[PDB]
Amino acid sequence: SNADDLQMIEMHELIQEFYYYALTKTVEGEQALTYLQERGFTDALIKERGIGFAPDSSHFCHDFLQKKGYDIELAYEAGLLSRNEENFSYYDRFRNRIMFPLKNAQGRIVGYSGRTYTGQEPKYLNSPETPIFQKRKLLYNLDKARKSIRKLDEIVLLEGFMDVIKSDTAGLKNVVATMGTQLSDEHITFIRKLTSNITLMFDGDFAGSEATLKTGQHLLQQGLNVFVIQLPSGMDPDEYIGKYGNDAFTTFVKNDKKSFAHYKVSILKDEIAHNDLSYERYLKELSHDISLMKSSILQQKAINDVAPFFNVSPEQLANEI
Template sequence: MKNLSYESIIKEIKRRLSIVSLIEAYLSLKRSGKNFVGICPFHDDKNPSLQVSEEKGLFHCFSCGAGGDIFGFMMRYNNISFPEAIVELAKRADVPLERQYRSPAREKSIADALFRINSLTCKFYHKALLESQEGKEALNYLSARGISLEMVKEFNLGYAPSSWNTLTKLLAAKNIPLGTAEEIGLVIKRQNKDSYYDRFRGRIIFPIKDVDGKVVGFGGRTISGEEPKYINSPESEIYHKKSILYGLDRSRDYIRREKHAVVVEGYMDFLSLFYAGIRNAVATLGTSLTREHAII
């Protein structure tokens, strides 16, 4: 098992561990046909909304939408990072890890790789908004909402093409593991197939950045009336929603100068205020103001 690559370690852990046995260590499951069901721990569940598929190695809640593989369950249930989930599950699966996989330097290396993937994706979406035929409608929508071309460029707004696999093909062509892209919410794995499709399609894209300006995730707004109106990147190793305030990378200095912040709910609210000259604003991305937000 020595010198396994990062991707190989993940595959080996998945091969050795039963997702049913793992989840049963935390909650009660009952067989339902070829799958298992239980009370979902991620929301106030009254009925067994959680379904676990041993065959697919996946869990999914049909009520709150939580889902993923063994790593996703561990991260969400125990509120830990992806590297921490790897270490914990490697112990359970008796998969030896080289020390580098547990070190802070290795964790930083993983995070840097995810940031690079998001940066590439951000540039792709931005170019699609400015240069594609589909993007013109999105630009017209933004203009009608008072968002100028200058602001589009300043905040790297983008557009996700309506095709099911435009981004997926780009990432594959760049030799980016699609399993890694799935972990940060850019693509979704098809059920019963070893293939992926784009999470964001036919939507205006708002890059979500940390305080240092690194892209940690994306928000996508429909312009066609499709529901839901907004979809966002899931939490990941580099994106923790309760610790991120949209626009803080741009408004931090203004907030310090004014000694207070104007807190709004969403992307468009923030951009409208910024355009109007109110630069000490931030957005909570649809959540209540958290303790972590206040500390920031």
């Protein structure tokens, strides 16, 4: 019910204050605080994002919510507690982790992502699916980014919410990320209402490129204008910012922004040049990709940029389309 959903949100918003105190003030939180500071988190950014620490006792959240008068079973359904199935007893889901609030599209805290700071697995532990937290719907930072997305008529999608935090602080505000999932049909429906222009800047590795191709292809087929920023090999946005600084980052993101078709063919360049079967198949694929582009201006530019990869004229490529 809506009443239950609101109670679950309250639980999240109240415990956030306790996690924040635990991180910034308590002895147990000192190592986690140092870890964040070494990753460039200022006191101000930690406060701004409401970042906290979940102690390792296994009953910190449980006892707090109990004292405040919340139903324990509801706290379990809200994803803040786990249940011992042999015992039927409850305990903290999040233990010894740095706690990043996950806000919904209206800016209410509806879940947490808890990162290890001691090399434990999983690296990140999220809230489970709950009535208020759904990974196929939530986009990290969307409530904060919405204004600039509309103003700039573009959304930028990163892999990691940490990348979003760093990018935002660096000056790139129109950024969001999923919570470790493939961009959903629901996400795309949400995004389309804000803008038709989406730029993908995933990590600079094989998995990142593969995800760029898959996600970009689907966005294109869904009728969006797709762009790609290619980070240096082995780097994600947080890592680029750390190495080159804010100004270099916001300049970089403004420089080599390629239409999806141009990015795709550049990835496939060597296979096309050596494998005649792939040559034929990718010429047809790229022809189809270009045909899907809603922008007449960018469609014509893509034709000019893609044609040389096949050693054909822009006129010949246009004919194929």
